[PDB]
Every structure is written in C-alpha cells, then in structure tokens.
Amino acid sequence: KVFGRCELAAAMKRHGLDNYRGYSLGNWVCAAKFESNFNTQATNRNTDGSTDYGILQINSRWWCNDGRTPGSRNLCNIPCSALLSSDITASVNCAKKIVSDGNGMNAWVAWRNRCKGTDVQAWIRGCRL
Template sequence: MKTFFILSALLAVASPYVYEKCELARVLRNNGLDGFHGYSLANWVCLIQYESSYNTRAIGRNSRAGQIVSSDYGIFQINSYWWCDDGQTQNSRNGCRRSCDDYINDNIADDIQCAKSVVSDPQGMNAWYGWKNNCKIRNLDNFLRECNL
C-alpha cells in the first residue's frame, strides 16, 4: 500500500496540464498575445494546437542522420538550439536566456515571454513548423467562435 501511494504521488507530480482550447485562449489574451506582432489570438491557439496539443510538458526531439540535434519544450515547443539551454544541444544560442526546463511546467508565463521573443524575430510565426504547415494557410476567422471571447 505504501508503494502504491508513493507511485501515485510521483505520477501526479509528473502529469502534464493540458489546456482546453478556450481556456488557453483566455490565458493568452490576458497575457497580451492577441494582436502581438500582428498575429491574432486564433493564430496563437492554432500554433499551440499543432505544436504541443495544449500540453504544458510536451517535449519534441529533432534529429538529423539519427542524431538528436535539438529539442522543443513546453506548450509553445521552444527550441533548444535557438531559444533555451537544455545542457545537451551543442552551440545553443539561448535567445530567451533560460533553461529549457523552465518551459515544461504548468506555469506558462515564462513560455509566453519567450514566445514573444521568437515571434519578434524576423521569421515571426514561421519559426514554428506547426503554424507554418497548418495555420498559416487556413482561414482562422471562426477558429475560436465557440469560446465567446
């Protein structure tokens, strides 16, 4: 029984928080992303849908020739080569000056600040393949209709 309790406690701590779309839209709007650098709130939510499926602790690995070259962290999938330091990616630029571990918890305030830096870069939202391949080409006028924002 004691082992079960400890295992349950560990699983509870390690469980990610997965936002609902409208809940996330409200958080992003309240943190100044609606219209930031000309991108609508729908673009931000769509980006997150395709990058992390609204999961605050998502981690993606990027490989070339079978070798991991960088990783993406958190709800925005912040890249370890360009934007954060994971201690594993060679020659990390660490543009947001933070550890990648900062982006895989349920507090997304620092994730939002880094995402603002990413989108302020000349590539804008094209820095995210999830947005470029799934949202950029779509009419997002009705994407958040059910959210009553």
C-alpha cells in the same frame, strides 16, 4: 497541464499574446494545437540533437538552455524546463521574442504548414474572451 482550447486562448490573451506582432489569438491557439495538442509538458527531440519544449515547442538550439544541445544559444535566458510549467508565462514571453526575430510565425514550421492562411478564428470561436 493539458489546457482546454478556450482556457488556453484566455491565458494567452492574459499574457498579451493576442494580436502580438499582428498575429491574432486564433493563430497562437492553432499553433499550440498542432505543436503540443495544448500540453505544456510536450517535448520532442530533433534530428540535430536539439529539443522542442512546451505548448509552443520552443527549440533549445536558439531559445532556451537544456545543457545538452552543443553550440546552441539561450536567447530567452531560461532553462528549457521553464517551458513545461502549468503557468505559460515563460513560454509566452519567449514566443514574443521568437515571433519578433524576423520571420514572424513562420518560425513555427507547424504554423506555416497547418495554420497559415486558414480560418484561424475557428480556434477561438465560442470562447468567452
């Protein structure tokens, strides 16, 4: 599913991501924009052989099981395929664990490089929320 910008903002808020660990909704929408362009089915293979999955490009080295990332963990206790669903519940619950892991949203290199320090509220501007 490719979400609309405000549609995704609403779904994220519905699932309790708004201001989670102090990160405003615009931060999460911005991260999703640059990680997946709002496409739940996004996947990307990393140099280390792990894969990133879903709207927030969650990585199989630590967070989910895909059966093909040697030496990895599955800390969210989910198949990576669950992160590709039109229903963002699994991605949101896993993101909550990731952002609580110590480095906040810096876990998403794209957030650090493209969202951090910017006017992230622009991402939810105009949205009925």
